[PDB]
Amino acid sequence: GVEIETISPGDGRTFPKKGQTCVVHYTGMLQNGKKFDSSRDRNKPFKFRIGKQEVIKGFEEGAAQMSLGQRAKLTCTPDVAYGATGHPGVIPPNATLIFDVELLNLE
Template sequence: MGVQIETITPGNKTNYPKAGDRVSMHYVGSLENGTVFDSSRKRGQPFKCAIGVGQLIRGWDEGVPKMSVGEKAKFVITPDYGYGANGIPGLIPGNSTLIFEVELLAIE
């Protein structure tokens, strides 16, 4: 249970975000069946947020700090680290395992 991280492309292996850092990322989120439910790439703008401060799902708060700048990784996030039993009505069914391809662009 939790978040599994598989590196797709290594980053610089020196700059890692820590709790409270603001980061810039691209991501594509999908369900296990391949249905894409969200994508910063489709919107054409990186997603910017503070990491490790409870603004995001637990899988991201725990997974992103393990990435270095420039890294692209695949996160497999179990429901307890994602949106849980409730999901997001009309978008993510309850108890869904989530798949994210995340690219850490910068720590701001």
């Protein structure tokens, strides 16, 4: 599942709720360290609410398992991610994933 790990936590208390735009500045990765996504270079923080089924459930479960100001090292799996189909042209079949997540705010 979302075998969460922390990097530099903050309060450990301000967990997210329903209808809360988690303002993330994540930096995704792949196994064997081959990068596949980012947000630090765009300078465009992500924004997504809980329960709206916008994102794969890995990010949602990682945010629910996370407090504010909490840099982290998430670890999803093919079960929650694109699976044996795989996102075409980027993700191959049956790929584990890594994310240097960092939540900042909620609106």
